[PDB]
Amino acid sequence: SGAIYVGNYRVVNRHLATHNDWANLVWEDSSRDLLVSSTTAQGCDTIARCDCQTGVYYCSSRRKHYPVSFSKPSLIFVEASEYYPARYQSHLMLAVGHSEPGDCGGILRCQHGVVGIVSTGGNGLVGFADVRDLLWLDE
Numbered sequence: 001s002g003a004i005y006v007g008n009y010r011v012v013n014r015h016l017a018t019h020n021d022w023a024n025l026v027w028e029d030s031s032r033d034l035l036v037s038s039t040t041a042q043g044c045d046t047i048a049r050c051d052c053q054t055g056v057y058y059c060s061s062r063r064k065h066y067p068v069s070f071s072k073p074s075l076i077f078v079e080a081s082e083y084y085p086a087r088y089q090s091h092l093m094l095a096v097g098h099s100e101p102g103d104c105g106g107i108l109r110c111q112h113g114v115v116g117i118v119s120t121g122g123n124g125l126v127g128f129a130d131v132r133d134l135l136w137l138d139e
């Protein structure tokens with residue numbers, strides 16, 4: 001679990017969105033596993049606007065942060081679940097690192113700010129849903 005709070009927005013994994021998130025929906029994309037809902041309180045997370053391929057992510061199954069090299073946002077296969085069927089998830093970035101069910105929502109950050117959130121994993125890999133292209137999160 002975990003979310004990004006920037007301005008009047010809350011960014012979460014679409015498969016983990018709540019009734020409140022859906023009732024205050026701004027945008028959602030099943031192919032990216034992202035949902036953005038509106039908030040009354042002002043968020044202060046800074047979003048990165050860069051092409052960094054190195055950063056640090058929070059791994060809740062170890063209560064630790066890990067440094068990672070990650071790939072550029074791309075289309076990548078993801079097995080079924082209480083939430084989705086086999087499909088290509090777009091805007092996904094992979095890294096060699098630990099992740100297990102329960103780790104979704106952990107933030108990935110570089111020197112410029114928030115890069116994305118944990119969305120997939122398995123086999124010694126971790127996948128992050130990129131948010132750097134969502135320029136509207138700032139305005």
Ligand SMILES: NC(=O)[C@H]1CCCN(C(=O)Cc2ccccc2OC(F)F)C1
Pocket residue numbers: 015033078079081083084089099100101102103104118119120121122123126127
């Ligand atoms: N379709 C999706 O984006 C995910 C929906 C929930 C299920 N998905 C996973 O990958 C679950 C998973 C399995 C083994 C290790 C780590 C895992 O993820 C965690 F890091 F994000 C896929």
Ligand SMILES: [Zn+2]
Pocket residue numbers: 048049050051052110111112113
């Ligand atoms: Zn950066």
